[PDB]
Design a protein around this ligand. Structure first.
Ligand SMILES: CC(=O)N[C@H]1/C(=N/O)O[C@H](CO)[C@@H](O)[C@@H]1O
Ligand SMILES: CC(=O)N[C@H]1/C(=N/O)O[C@H](CO)[C@@H](O)[C@@H]1O
Ligand SMILES: [Mg+2]
Ligand SMILES: [Mg+2]
Length: 433
């Protein structure tokens, strides 16, 4: 029961790349079928591909008009990637999508990423007329990351997150504020080091109070999200980067999506340290990542074969960087990404990844009762014209299906399937008096 109670989530990068309501519905269908609990839909991730009906934003002592914010975001997204399939989901489409998922017992968790992976928002701010929103590192400007010294750019971004969080209030549980990979383009993936550097290496031109300002920013977004009754979530890499607790403390109410154990020269906090600090953890192990278009061995990092191997070899309970500690989890999340958003989206490949994650951790995933429900619906309603003996058999087989534990896992699917087969057999054996 502890296993089935955890979240099982599929994540889809619909920030970089357009996904239609139809495509997303198909993903929800498969998520439900395979025993998942939630769809994690990035809508702000480099591109920004979700537009509310009212996008007016009040910040910087004015209001930026809804139609101007919309045009600025559409344009800004296209400058990142002008997807021939579409630009953004509308509010009507999102509301319907959330309802469609809810009716299948699937939750939706959105991400609108900042202060990194926000290319489109930075573009949109410039189109509105806000100056120099981008972070720069010794003359190299980030296309993805806002400068936390820029009060006007920061105020706008916070007000945009508030606007989205207000929409998602009461229709979702968790809002992912992201926070991953600060200035990864401008700093060669050393952005957290750069933000912390001035404290330890002063008078060398590193950003003054960089990391301290990042903690304040993260905590302000957390406050914003919490005000709407949503649980804030964020990726782990910048949270106590280098295990450094001396700059300040992160809001404990931020759920940590633990996706990386770090790499050479990129020393992230262990999941042990994060749990000890009082954060709940969603295991988002990059062992299971799939980047669209990288479809076989040799086709690059996070290719489909690598992800399928990661799923086979790294269970849902194996969290990045545990230090050998027992790390509790709220659930696990397998993620598909669109780093090259011109890549073809292949539903079958995504569904293979999803199916493998479910099968490899089958005790955690809900069983499928849909065919059992259908089988019961197909039983002839009136049995009077059949022999007592053949009728009793059908009634007992029906009882057997209705008696199944309603909380079986995917590991126990055969119990359900055998019960369906028995009912079908007894119905075919009904004999006219
Ligand atoms: C908003 C919406 O379309 N809801 C439908 C639905 N959402 O998943 O599928 C159910 C069947 O599974 C239908 O009974 C619901 O009417
Ligand atoms: C939290 C996270 O996963 N961040 C990035 C990532 N960094 O290595 O890997 C993915 C796959 O390349 C990218 O799509 C993500 O934007
Ligand atoms: Mg650009
Ligand atoms: Mg009926």
């Amino acid at each position: 029961n502890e296993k089935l109670a955890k979240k099982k989530i599929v994540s889809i990068d619909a920030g970089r790349k357009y996904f239609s309501p139809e495509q997303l519905k198909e993903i929800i269908d498969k998520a439900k079928h395979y025993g998942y609990t939630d769809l994690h839909l990035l809508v702000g991730n480099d591109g920004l591909r979700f537009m509310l009906d009212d996008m007016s934003i009040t910040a910087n002592g004015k209001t930026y008009a809804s139609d101007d914010v919309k045009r600025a975001i559409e344009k800004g997204t296209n400058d990142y990637y002008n997807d021939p399939n579409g630009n953004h989901l509308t509010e009507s489409q999102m509301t319907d999508l959330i309802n469609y998922a809810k009716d299948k017992g699937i939750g939706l968790i959105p991400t609108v990423n900042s202060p990194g992976h926000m290319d489109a928002i930075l573009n949109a701010m410039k189109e509105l007329g806000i100056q120099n929103p981008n972070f720069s590192y010794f003359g190299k400007k980030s296309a993805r990351t806002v400068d936390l010294d820029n009060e006007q750019a920061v105020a706008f971004t916070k007000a945009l997150i508030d606007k989205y969080a207000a929409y998602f209030a009461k229709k979702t549980e968790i809002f992912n504020i992201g926070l991953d990979e600060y200035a990864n383009d401008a700093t060669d993936a050393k952005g957290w080091s750069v933000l912390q550097a001035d404290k330890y290496y002063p008078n060398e031109g590193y950003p003054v109070k960089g990391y301290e300002k990042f903690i304040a920013y993260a905590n302000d977004l957390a406050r914003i999200v919490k005000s709407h009754g949503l649980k804030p979530m964020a990726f782990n890499d910048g949270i106590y980067y280098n295990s450094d607790t001396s700059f300040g403390s992160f809001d404990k109410d931020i759920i940590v999506s633990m996706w990386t154990g770090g790499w050479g020269g990129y020393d992230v906090a262990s999941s042990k340290l994060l749990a000890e600090k009082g954060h709940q953890i969603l295991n988002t192990n990059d062992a299971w990542y799939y980047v669209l278009g990288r479809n076989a061995d040799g086709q690059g990092w996070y290719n489909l074969d690598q992800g399928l191997n990661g799923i086979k070899n790294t269970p849902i309970t194996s969290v990045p960087k545990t230090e050998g500690a027992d790390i509790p989890i709220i659930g696990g999340m397998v993620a598909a990404w669109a780093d090259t958003p011109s890549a073809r989206y292949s539903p079958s490949r995504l569904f293979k990844l999803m199916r493998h994650f479910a099968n490899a951790n089958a005790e955690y995933f809900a069983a499928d009762y849909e065919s059992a429900e259908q089988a019961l619906n197909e039983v002839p309603k009136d049995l009077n014209r059949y022999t007592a003996e053949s009728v009793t058999a059908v009634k007992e087989a029906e009882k057997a299906i209705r008696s199944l534990d309603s909380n079986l896992s995917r590991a126990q699917q055969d119990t359900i399937d055998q019960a369906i087969a028995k009912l079908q057999e007894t119905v075919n054996n009904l004999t006219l008096t």
